[PDB]
Design a protein around this ligand. Sequence first.
Ligand SMILES: [Mg+2]
Ligand SMILES: [Mg+2]
Ligand SMILES: [Mg+2]
Ligand SMILES: [Mg+2]
Lengths: 245, 245
Amino acid sequence: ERVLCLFDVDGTLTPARQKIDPEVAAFLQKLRSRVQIGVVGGSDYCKIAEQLGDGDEVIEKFDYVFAENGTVQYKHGRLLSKQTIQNHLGEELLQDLINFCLSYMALLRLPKKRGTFIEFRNGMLNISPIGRSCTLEERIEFSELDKKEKIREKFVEALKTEFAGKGLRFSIGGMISFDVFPEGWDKRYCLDSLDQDSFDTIHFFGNETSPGGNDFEIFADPRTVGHSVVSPQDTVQRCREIFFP
Amino acid sequence: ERVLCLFDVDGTLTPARQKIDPEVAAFLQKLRSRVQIGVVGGSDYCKIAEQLGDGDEVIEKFDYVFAENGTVQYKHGRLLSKQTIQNHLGEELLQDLINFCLSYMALLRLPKKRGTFIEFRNGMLNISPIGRSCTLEERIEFSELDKKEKIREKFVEALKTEFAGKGLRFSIGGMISFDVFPEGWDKRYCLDSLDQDSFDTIHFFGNETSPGGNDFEIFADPRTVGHSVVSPQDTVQRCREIFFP
Ligand SMILES: [Mg+2]
Ligand SMILES: [Mg+2]
Ligand SMILES: [Mg+2]
Ligand SMILES: [Mg+2]
């Protein structure tokens, strides 16, 4: 009777990192006549907003907007207070991590380096050996070397070992960087806030629900009814079979 | 007959990092009936724009806008192509510099660290041991420790020695960082483009014209008639005595 449909963004509602198909967007509003709707994605709010509407339309079109896995939350148009990664980790482990990354990267010799090797976000640290302020052409150059030399994979191996047992998780994505985040700060983070909003049912839809995928944990969590999808059209179809049969 | 008045921003036209007094702004437009007018400042365009008008009004109010010491140029409303620091320095010296900074900072133990330890700009690298993405409260905390421990001063000493003779310059400013930039990329940078615009006279006004100041080089350059000022009101007064006597 009080139902929430909660969607991953990339590959679930939109082409990855691209704008939503207006027909999919159209269905989501129709679905909204039967249930509340939310999104949860690993990217920051500005990226998610850009994919799902013009300006800040996303917070009006969706009942919930969980950016950076729910460390940033919009609830019915309202922004809620955010928790810092330093509050969760503590300053000492945070700096141990930062200094290990600085020390490791200083020894990496690349074709090019730029700036923003460590980006401090709400839900993670983003580590990029080339530097995030590089151009697209520079990204591609690094990506091709990285496939040959496994630069990011080896850095992640050394970090996991060094911080073994200290509650840090790692994910390599895109061309130039990897993510470092606390255990529990995958997509499941958003569920703790959702637990207090009196939903009879929360249906989660994602395209990475297999082990290793970024939807695995929230999909498998007992607080959600999980649904595996392979495309936005599959998502729309599943939602019809369930809510408009 | 073809005259340009070229002004530093901070302490010359406005309170440092603050909005221009509307009366000063008013005089500058009157001055514009007799001469062309330009600004040159070390900060990026967005900061300079914010101090001198609303939105992009600055490029309409001034004939020239030289941001980041002239590595970024607006000329009569038009943005000109910019040169990269890597093009000027070369990739090898640039990375030697970046890796020395990464290696040095990894050994610094601070109360707090965040992100963006190396910010890649158009006219410089900005190095911040705490990380530029810190809060104002965090900035002040670092600033007070830095006065006690001379963290930035000692880092600059080691860098100058290590890159002795290789054409790098350093400036420590504000609370959390220092600037690294190529020789010649002080305010004089903007003069090379100006040399081609057929001015009979270029009058430069600045509040840091003594040795060590960030206006010293452009003030002393033989391509300018230099003027030392101590406040925006002094600037307006000097411009009256010269152009409205
Ligand atoms: Mg996905
Ligand atoms: Mg589940
Ligand atoms: Mg000044
Ligand atoms: Mg001169």
